[PDB]
């Protein structure tokens, strides 16, 4: 391939002339180290240095990659594997077609399963058994001492929930990692893989090379700063987050607080203190409860919705299933562990069986889930905030019975919710007028009846910026908390 | 002396451990050397004694602070600096990589003992190891200021909205160029292009905002970017041969003019 | 390749012969002649040679062994065989081949640390045996195939334990059992398997270690790993008159109050001395603790701290622990399809501690298998035509919640807990914790909690009045006390305990031998705390006090006042 030689020469040119300091000289010198054998190259540098080479590499990556490795070896020997990053286009798994074979593209997905490290033979030195002729440098089409071996890892990935179209089964893709890419991915994580889609004998397999997990624009930064100085920011956020819901602002404040969340702390004894908030809502059917769930689901991209009775114990935390090809037992992820570092919403929590809530128990407080079933021993992280909705035992809150009698929930379950709101429906004329006018105005004036103080994207950016701070507790706050808790605990739901 | 004898013994242990680690293309880290010495001699190992060695015979090793050291599944973060030790050995004339042979090991321990004897003939201060890198009047004044600022903001809000978008255009232009490079197509629909740009942009935005940004790009820069109305849809065609730096300069000039 | 040269090969063979017949220990004794005499007396087929002595004497051999293992080991086996023939010509009649075993390899590597660079190299590894095959003959020999997983204590949380295969020949056959912690020295070789190549779609080699030396990982190695500085610190702590106070105060610094529960858990952790009188019956030296408490007392925090502190610890939940999961079960191998045993949680808890959370959630069928391991500390598996016995010497700590969520003081302890009487009887220490509204206790709790919250911020990162000990020092003290002390009960007054037991019978029929046994092993453990070879009666007094406190806490309110009045002599 003459164009491959041209690409090799141009890659040498890029390695030798890119700058006022050449970025890759130190990396190439570090490539001499035995533990370092892959070079990371930015795609934006390649495209800005020259365009024909960038397009050729983007179009014939498989054709010129071994020539790229030859160029890298030549450059290093004058004083090995090539990895690429920062491709500006993201693609979906459902977009993967046969027309894209050989193209350098990067795919986003969530890792569900992993396989152990295997040695892969690239070039083998063969000894003939008839004439004792040593045949060296024999490539493999998919003497051990003088042959070359490369570490391998097999990764099974699953489509992300957001990209999943309604009513569709999330398809799975196999990912091959070699050399430094081995063991760089962990099960249950969401990663972006840069590479190509190869044809395995047919079969579809993606070969990857790299993995993925102050600089903000001036106007966005200044808008965040200016809005951070608003004195009525709390009430404005409360109004803007629920423009179409009338009253019940206490629930709005509570859900906003649990969106902010606290800080987790790990003691010197290795014990971790939960920095999240769990909220339960119990109310008469009239009061809107599922609307809050839908709003928090559509606003937060990291939110998961599920029904009460339709969910089993295995489907929530995890299940143990025997793998067909491996003839072994593996673990399939549940809803709770997929909502890691997010929020999980449960509707009709009362209809759930006790056999399911007892499984929820561990994830509620200890924030982790452990499985000891059928010779499989593991513990999994369940760092989630739970928002639960339920109704009283009877559809109507009967005041002829005590408060404790009206809620059919276990004592630890009652205790492990931080905020517990109970809604009672009353017949008031002014409330009826307000609710009716709001509903009819929404039904007739869909868009012009919405006045949002801040944009949803702006709120999301502010929330992302705010969550990374870890405030300190003052001594005045310390003794104030002491005295407040003194007064509070001195008075069903024990404190 | 007893202290110097212990120094020599642990120096021999250090040399053996470094030789074992280096002979198999493995980078000798401080933790592994400490573990090996502690197993070999049942004695505490610490950086002060290494600094004492460096004071005695600095030519034994080169000490560096390095990152990106793979510690297997130990949960070690990448930002954790690690102190590495590289043996300083004379290069042979045979052309092979230097190896700590038993002859060199004996030579090194003998040289260390000779240095100790010379020091006695004259505690050792450790060498500095390389460290890792009225209220009414005020209210009326405030009301006057508010009225003046309100008269100031009677100007159309859209004027500043376009200015806001003008800063966002160059990066979006680069993204659009990359998308058209990736798609191998001369023309694309509004829906697919906007969806891909949103799914690849660094800022979360609505499809309508992307449509208005595309319209602004078309109106400002018609020669690069052309729009064609076909049936019930508008398709996007771009010239891929244009220089991106010149386009960025033109966009900067346009933004400056609009200011 | 250089070793394959005939000249150096033969010269090294004779050099190894001279090393065998010439080495002198520090005491002036040729050790290998004593070893060969012992092996001849025992008619064994393997010889054990220390790698340290060989490295000290011949550095070139120590360099060559990891690099050319197979050829050099075969040469050394032939040299040993001919040396034996020269020394014991008749020994050819009992054995035809003798193998050389290499022990104490300085380089110890984990299963996770295995790479391509270790291929066809001698590597020392440590782990726990999970499954083993039978003895298989070969048309050359004895064969053993075993499956080894990483030690659960060493495995970090959130990551599955990895498994590897090992091969044993001749003498090494049947040298280990499933569930036994061992360290191995062997050759990390690769195997050609076309099935893996077809399944994965490319050449894959299954790496299997061929072990050379097998050594079970008893705590003797841990004793050897102890620094003399650690020993002197432990001894200096032992001579302290207030060592017990600081030991009890050193447990759960983040938790306030609750002296009795931490006292009992520490006393169980130190453990007693198991005994096997006459080989007819075996007396356990283990303490079983059951913890029933009102919610809000941080029982799970105590269990988690115990999980972290213990050198060997396994944590299980009530919902996720099945009978098959907890115990060993028979399974057909997916590849070779013979019946295989996979060890349960309790089996991997052997010599360690097992923690059970929400034990009141246990299914009764799952409970049935528990009593056997509780009473005999061994499990007999009779399934699919395979009958095997496995050791279950573990300390079990179980957590439970009272029915209804609140402990009723007007009812017996048996009634408040949904467990059968034999299960409670198997337990040795019972501790009940209630929730009371005391303003001064509330002040203390709030102050301590807020102080702990201030202390343990990442940005910023007693009742007895004694300073808590460091965690590492406490762990080292626990290891040394477990592995050194063996108390003797030669100064016990049987009349006092007989009178106390008669009173116990009188006051229990108004409302057994294993209670006396638990008190005896409790006194043994308390003596082990102070590092005393013989038991002083103060240990007996403290054991009696804590046992009586535990017993009265399980009675109704209407009688505990009378019980305290009757036994005010011992409680004072
Ligand atoms: N404050 C309110 N503002 C606007 N609409 C409301 C308000 N309260 C109730 N509604 C209306 O009442 C409907 C009931 O909402 P839901 O959240 O589904 O009720 P619910 O309490 O969850 O009852 P269940 O649990 O689904 S049987 C909403 O969809 C709104 O149309
Ligand atoms: N005495 C205490 N001192 C300090 N912190 C405490 C104390 N009791 C409880 N806590 C705190 O309360 C948190 C929650 O207690 P839990 O451990 O969930 O209660 P519990 O007694 O184990 O009952 P369950 O099992 O949750 S129903 C713990 O993580 C501690 O931080
Ligand atoms: Mg609802
Ligand atoms: Mg608990």
From Swiss-Prot, chain A:
It is an enzyme of class 3 (hydrolase). GO terms for cellular component: chromosome, telomeric region; CMG complex; cytosol; MCM complex; nucleoplasm; nucleus. O-glycosylated (O-GlcNAcylated), in a cell cycle-dependent manner. The modification Phosphoserine is found at residue 168. The keyword Repeat does not apply. Changing residue 128 to Y: Found in patients with microcephaly, developmental delay, typical facial characteristics, endocrine disorders, feeding difficulties and urogenital anomalies; uncertain significance; impairs cell proliferation and ciliogenesis. Keywords: Acetylation, ATP-binding, Cell cycle, Chromosome, DNA replication, DNA-binding, Glycoprotein, Helicase, Hydrolase, Nucleotide-binding, Nucleus, Phosphoprotein. It comes from the Eukaryota. Residues 233-440 form the MCM domain. Acts as a component of the MCM2-7 complex (MCM complex) which is the replicative helicase essential for 'once per cell cycle' DNA replication initiation and elongation in eukaryotic cells. Core component of CDC45-MCM-GINS (CMG) helicase, the molecular machine that unwinds template DNA during replication, and around which the replisome is built. Early fractionation of eukaryotic MCM proteins yielded a variety of dimeric, trimeric and tetrameric complexes with unclear biological significance. Specifically a MCM467 subcomplex is shown to have in vitro helicase activity which is inhibited by the MCM2 subunit. The MCM2-7 hexamer is the proposed physiological active complex. Component of the MCM2-7 complex. The complex forms a toroidal hexameric ring with the proposed subunit order MCM2-MCM6-MCM4-MCM7-MCM3-MCM5. Component of the CMG helicase complex, a hexameric ring of related MCM2-7 subunits stabilized by CDC45 and the tetrameric GINS complex. May interact with MCM10. Interacts with TIPIN. Interacts with CDT1. Interacts with MCMBP. Interacts with DDI2. This is DNA replication licensing factor MCM6.
Swiss-Prot record, chain B:
It is found in: Nucleus; Chromosome, Centromere, Kinetochore. Residues 166-259 are annotated as: Interaction with LRWD1. Induction: Induced by E2F transcription factors. Transmembrane segments: none annotated. Belongs to the Cdt1 family. The PIP-box K+4 motif mediates both the interaction with PCNA and the recruitment of the DCX(DTL) complex: while the PIP-box interacts with PCNA, the presence of the K+4 submotif, recruits the DCX(DTL) complex, leading to its ubiquitination. It is linked to Meier-Gorlin syndrome 4: A syndrome characterized by bilateral microtia, aplasia/hypoplasia of the patellae, and severe intrauterine and postnatal growth retardation with short stature and poor weight gain. Additional clinical findings include anomalies of cranial sutures, microcephaly, apparently low-set and simple ears, microstomia, full lips, highly arched or cleft palate, micrognathia, genitourinary tract anomalies, and various skeletal anomalies. Required for both DNA replication and mitosis. DNA replication licensing factor, required for pre-replication complex assembly. Cooperates with CDC6 and the origin recognition complex (ORC) during G1 phase of the cell cycle to promote the loading of the mini-chromosome maintenance (MCM) complex onto DNA to generate pre-replication complexes (pre-RC). Required also for mitosis by promoting stable kinetochore-microtubule attachments. Potential oncogene. This is DNA replication factor Cdt1. The gene is CDT1.
Curated annotation (Swiss-Prot), chain C:
Phosphorylation by the CDC7-DBF4 complex during G1/S phase is required for the initiation of DNA replication. GO terms for biological process: apoptotic process; cellular response to interleukin-4; cochlea development; DNA replication; DNA replication initiation; double-strand break repair via break-induced replication; mitotic DNA replication initiation; nucleosome assembly. One of its GO terms (molecular function) is zinc ion binding. ADP binds at residues 300-301. GO terms for cellular component: chromatin; chromosome, telomeric region; cilium; CMG complex; cytoplasm; cytosol; intracellular membrane-bounded organelle; MCM complex. It catalyses: ATP + H2O = ADP + phosphate + H(+). It is found in: Nucleus; Chromosome. Acts as a component of the MCM2-7 complex (MCM complex) which is the replicative helicase essential for 'once per cell cycle' DNA replication initiation and elongation in eukaryotic cells. Core component of CDC45-MCM-GINS (CMG) helicase, the molecular machine that unwinds template DNA during replication, and around which the replisome is built. This is DNA replication licensing factor MCM2. It comes from Homo sapiens. The lineage of its organism: Eukaryota, Metazoa, Chordata, Craniata, Vertebrata. The gene is MCM2.
